[PDB]
Design a protein around this nucleic acid. Structure first.
Lengths: 108, 203
RNA sequence: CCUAGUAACGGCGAGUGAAGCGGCAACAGCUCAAAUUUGAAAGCUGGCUUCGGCCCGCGUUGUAAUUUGGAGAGGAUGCUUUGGGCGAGGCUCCUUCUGAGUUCCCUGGAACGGGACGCCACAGAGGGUGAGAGCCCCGUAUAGUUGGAAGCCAAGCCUGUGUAAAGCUCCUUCGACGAGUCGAGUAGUUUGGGAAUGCUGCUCAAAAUGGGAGGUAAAUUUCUUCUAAAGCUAAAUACCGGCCAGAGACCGAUAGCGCACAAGUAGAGUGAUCGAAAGAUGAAAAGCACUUUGAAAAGAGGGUUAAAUAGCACGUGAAAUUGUUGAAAGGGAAGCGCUUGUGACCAGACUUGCGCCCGGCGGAUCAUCCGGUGUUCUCACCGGUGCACUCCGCCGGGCUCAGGCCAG
RNA sequence: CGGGACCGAGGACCGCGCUCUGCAAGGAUGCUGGCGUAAUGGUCACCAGCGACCCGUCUUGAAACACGGACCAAGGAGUCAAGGUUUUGCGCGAGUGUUUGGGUGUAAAACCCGCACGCGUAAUGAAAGUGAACGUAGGUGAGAGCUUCGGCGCAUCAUCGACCGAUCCUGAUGUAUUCGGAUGGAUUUGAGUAGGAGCGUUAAGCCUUGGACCCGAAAGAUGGUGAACUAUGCUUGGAUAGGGU
RNA sequence: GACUAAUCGAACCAUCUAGUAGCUGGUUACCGCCGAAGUUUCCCUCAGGAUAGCAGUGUCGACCUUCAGUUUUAUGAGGUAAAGCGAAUGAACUUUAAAUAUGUAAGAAGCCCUUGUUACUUAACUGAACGUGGGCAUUCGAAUGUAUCGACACUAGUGGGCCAUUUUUGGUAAGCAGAACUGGCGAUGCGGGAUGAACCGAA
RNA sequence: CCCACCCAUACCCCGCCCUCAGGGUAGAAACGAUGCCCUGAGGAGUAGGCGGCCGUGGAGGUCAGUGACGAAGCCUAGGGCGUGAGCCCGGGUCGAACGGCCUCUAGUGCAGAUCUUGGUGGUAGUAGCAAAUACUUCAAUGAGAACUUGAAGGACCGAAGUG
RNA sequence: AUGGCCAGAAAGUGGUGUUGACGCAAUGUGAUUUCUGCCCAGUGCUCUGAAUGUCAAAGUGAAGAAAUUCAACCAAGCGCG
RNA sequence: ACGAGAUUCCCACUGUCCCUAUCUACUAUCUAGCGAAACCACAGCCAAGGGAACGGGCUUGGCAAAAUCAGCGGGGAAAGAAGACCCUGUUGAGCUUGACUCUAGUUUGACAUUGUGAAAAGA
RNA sequence: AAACUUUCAACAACGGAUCUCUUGGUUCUGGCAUCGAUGAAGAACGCAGCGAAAUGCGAUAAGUAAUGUGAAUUGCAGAAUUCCGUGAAUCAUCGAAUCUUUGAACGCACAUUGCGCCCGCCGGUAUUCCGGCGGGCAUGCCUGUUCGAGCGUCAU
């Protein structure tokens, strides 16, 4: 608004390689760390799993459905077996999933 | 990063006609629906999978059904655009799954189709009888025949005894080995050819 | 819309800058050339018609049917498909028509203002009428309601049926597909494509699983996508022109278009062109009868008006600048600041209040109690009781206090 | 112990005190007179005493010079858009953003809807690629607040460590015996991790690009109009006493 | 370089076009709170730049630690005045010691001891450095003052001007010219020097 | 050398304004708490920075706002408030609309630009109104006759003309 | 004259040109009288006189799987004479 | 010879002076009518002082009396003087040349237009 | 003392600010697709009882027809209208017409109201002369018709 400006107060006093035809869809691989892995489970089922009322079932998480292609390994996991389906996985993320007692399945 | 070095004021497009254009579009849609009644306002579309590795997780509506899909559904290609089915002669069926899905889509549409006779006094056997011509209908095929499950389900549950063993050596090692084999496919072939030539020479 | 100020281009860097995917709006698909109708040019312009046709011709150096790559042609095979004519009803556009105060009082020249009593309202949008009008008038809202024309959509209903044309399924086979074109070199230009772009000129100049593309040059071997050098097609999109219409936190006659007016006018320039200024009496002309002075313009009386302090110089009528009248100052500038004085002209303040003690009036909304009601639940209001040493006003006296200005 | 001047802020009591029936002790009362209106007071005009350069503007350090100003009325100059950045307010918060569009409407309003997408939630490298916990998310020294009074310690700062990517060196088990790259080191590096802080919007300041606070140059370019003046030429016409030699 | 319609070293008309200017002119109410500056350091100069310094608004952090254009004390520089040489010796002599201003230092955030290591150094476990532990709160170890803190963020002008005292370096026939500190002015009214950028008093 | 005296916006005491700082104020008899009460210090200012207020055109809400028994505007040696920009009232003129408060909004505030447009002064009843030889008498017309007409005179062009 | 000197964007275009060396075009000087200090050979003017010395595009040869690279040859002008 | 070309001198001649005087017409002047403009911060007596070599206004003095007319050319005003000159430019423009980059014209080569027969020399 | 100059006030002037008004601009939105050889846009010249312009119109000239409405127009003059109607009006609508000279502009020209050619009709004594009136006569190209040209190719 013009009535709040300073002019009204001052009235009276004045490298590397080139890549031709880059297609960004070739390089689409969003990543999620394992410390956010349980947030993809729906809230009621996640609280049941974390409380321990599901001792005979394991959650199967499809990262590509949630929009992720790579499972990275920042954080720690609870001691619950989880099946994770991913296009890519880091070595530490696989190591932590295996310690948690699940398995990383490769998909395309 | 301001691109104002041309005569930009000559080519400024404001959009004060946005509500008026929405009103005009809605009036045109109402006129088209009234002209097309009792047919739906749009055509039946197939389910296709989006290209590239970024978007192949998701399915959407395609342009038209293939000739192979129409043949497997038993709908002739000249009858199909006259009963509200879009036809695309360019698209092919490289795999059985999309073909089966679109054939089932066409069969569901054919089971729900009500076909009025060309002459009321002389019905044919391909036509819907008058006792079955009265039913509650739909007028939006994009709504009633949309994409029901566009992505895969993000969460399922299996028993702990059904947990897979996994690829031997680990998924990370499997990915590294796949990349290494793809990079060394030609060198190993050349080495094997040279070894075979040497064995043939000095057998 | 996003991709994206990204990939990329760029002296000495200022800068430049797409596309695929994805969401949406809108969606609609097709016609030729390359084939022998060959048991029948089956095609077509024009003329004359008795409207039945008949002629002059075009055309075989190819006019119809058939086919267009999604295919098709030939076969095989057995089922399906079709032509006309009515048409209820609906929609579009002009046309007839639509509610309620001019009720009473005051101000006013005039109510359309103020007050009272009403009424209409799917209408209280807007405008007019002698001042702010829902009900004075035009219109406004809503369903409809008179009369007319031309189209479109359409529930259904009558009939002909297969000479012929058309669709579906299978197949040994066949399956023509655009040349100075594509492409290459070179030059200019252009592009983000100054290694990967397009266009054009000159030179060379193709092919038959061929050819083009696959954004780093080349050879070899693969792969993936289409099918150029012929052609048609609605919608979503644009719109400082034209026509019709509705609006605005826009401007209010030096503003807003140059133009609210006989404005692209008057005027200027040989010409191309340049290009203004300029709105408002009053409700109604009622635009001053008549008398008188002047040659006249006009003046003075006297009417008109609500007002001429509105007289076609016209609503209001500021300043600069001028005239008259009144007051004042002035020995080579005035103006201004502080402070008196003189003269002229003014705003306040004050006019008496409150409280006691007597006397005279006029009334019982004195205290207590009873009932009802409300409240903040213990305080109040209303009705009865006061019977005048009690309350409330008024009038005469007296007294205390407080009251304006300047001073000792 | 006299004589004089200027002033009287405050507004129940409270306090410190004293010479203690009260007081000169945390700020003036008491008595009296005239007048009650232009008398006091005020405004204007003028005289008098004292005081007092003509305003911007420019320049440099400053003056002077220079430039503008006859007078009055009306316009008349830091604006809007896009993109940044910091700060303020607000909503939601590991998310956030309805408005391209669709639905709806009392119709450019308001209300409602959701796929995609943008930004954020992960970085590093030219790239292929790889990708963030030894530890109650570490130790030490401070540190508001809390504490059961032993300590716990926010934000933040300093320092030493740990993890991720890039660079260099070494090269384990294994093996398509030529691939793979574990383990262990060393330098820097990156606004990297180490118990998320962002997204949207409002307001203000500053930049950056546009005519960009307003008024001007000699210019440059595109397309038109002129030989009625004047210059030269062509065609066709007209005109110029009387003397001397 | 004449003339080409009062226009000619390139006519006139309209447009691009509101062309550009770093140069000139102008740039619109009031009050209140703060409030400036001229080689500091680097870059090839003029037709140059940044940058330090000085300012204002917001905040935040325990606005916590204290700090200071000052004196004193210890010790430097200035040993230079001076006293004596019945002290030695002879400004260059010294027991002692000037004036003006001036550097450094003056605590618990400190001092010292001890233990090891050293890749420093030393003949050297020797000094020094790095760690380790301990002792010293009995006074926290001069004076005076102390609404004077710190860190960010954003914003703005000025950043090789004039005059003067003192110190210093050069000069001229005489004028004078460079630096350093300080004060004043540009930005500032008042009293006095009759008058006034640079004087005195006082803001 | 000595005594007295004169006066600065400097110094001392007192009043008032503003700014800054430090305190008090709820089982609220309680407050534009954005208030009130107590105490102390301070006051120049260009470039520059910040805060608060005043004013103008328009918009939403509100004041059951003003107004033909006179809105707006204008004039005023008439007054009141404010440090100030300004605000309010009286008197006169006038004729149809306008204002206060809280928000919103901007084409929002002039002495200058050899501005822009329009209007008006002093100069000033001034400079001039002086090339081309020149006018005069009577009568008529008329409100009015040097510059109209008729007559009467006097002159000029002087045939490359004032034809 | 299949020419000179000009003009035009081009033209089956125009001019000089209804022209032809006693002509046309371009220069310098400027009536008459006077008048060409003496001699060259550096720059310049012009000689198709031999060379390939420099040497473009096209064309020719060699290598290579090709992109390409390397070689001679090489007009006018320059150079040499 | 010719010349509105530049220069020196001689005779004649004379108001060029010496040395000024006088006359005429039209103005100026006065009146009737008519009637501008330039310019204008405000104004107009001086002297000394007013550091920046400048005062009209300040300081200190001299002084100083309404309202006017004809002249006048010392200041003050007054020159399309915002001229001319000098200085500066991210200056503009005309002009010149072995300045740079280009270019019309001209010239040289090659490919195409471009055909039909011979003879000779090389493959 | 007056006059003069200046200051202050009242009234009167000068001038056109201020206020209020607005059949106008400006911007946005919505709808529509329609110029011309069947002669457009533009230009000129004319037309009313009394008009110069603006407006409307074209020698049928501020207009004709037709349809609708239903009593005006108005500045003056003159007439209305059988008002129980083929009907006023500077009315509205608009399907039928008129539409001068031009202009792409078309017989050739045009700085001329210049000069022609073809075919009809009428009038004046008129087979011959004169006059008037009507319809025609541009260019490029297409389809067709008809008349042609050329040893260009042939047959006879």
């Amino acid at each position: 608004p013009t009535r709040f400006s300073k002019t009204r107060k001052h009235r009276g006093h004045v490298v590397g390689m080139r890549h031709f035809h880059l297609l960004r869809n070739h390089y689409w691989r969003p990543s999620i760390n394992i410390d956010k892995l349980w947030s993809l489970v729906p809230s009621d089922v996640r609280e049941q799993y974390l409380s321990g009322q599901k001792k005979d079932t394991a959650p199967v998480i499809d990262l590509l459905s949630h929009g992720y292609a790579k499972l990275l390994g920042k954080g720690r996991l609870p001691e619950i077996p989880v099946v994770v389906r991913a296009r890519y996985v880091s070595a530490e993320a696989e190591r932590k999933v295996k310690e948690a007692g699940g398995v990383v399945e490769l998909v395309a | 990063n301001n691109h104002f070095r041309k005569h930009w004021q000559r080519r400024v497009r404001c959009h004060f006609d946005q509500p008026g254009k929405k009103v005009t579009r809605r009036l045109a849609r109402r006129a088209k629906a009234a002209a097309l009644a009792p047919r739906p306002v749009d055509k039946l579309r197939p389910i296709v999978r989006c290209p590239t590795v970024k978007y192949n997780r998701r399915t959407r509506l395609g342009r038209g059904f293939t000739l192979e899909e129409l043949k497997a559904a038993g709908i002739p290609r000249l009858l199909a655009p006259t009963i509200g089915i879009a036809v695309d002669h360019r698209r092919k069926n490289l795999s059985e799954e999309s073909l089966a899905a679109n054939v089932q889509r066409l069969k569901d549409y054919k089971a729900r189709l009500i076909l009025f006779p060309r002459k009321s006094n002389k019905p044919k056997k391909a036509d819907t009888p008058k006792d079955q011509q009265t039913a509650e209908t739909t007028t939006s095929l994009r709504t009633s025949f949309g994409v029901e499950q566009p992505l895969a389900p993000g969460f399922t549950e299996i028993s702990k005894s059904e947990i897979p063993a996994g690829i031997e050596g680990g998924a990370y090692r499997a990915l590294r080995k796949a990349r290494s084999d793809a990079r060394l496919v030609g060198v190993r072939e050349k080495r094997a050819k040279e070894k075979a030539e040497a064995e043939a020479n000095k057998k």
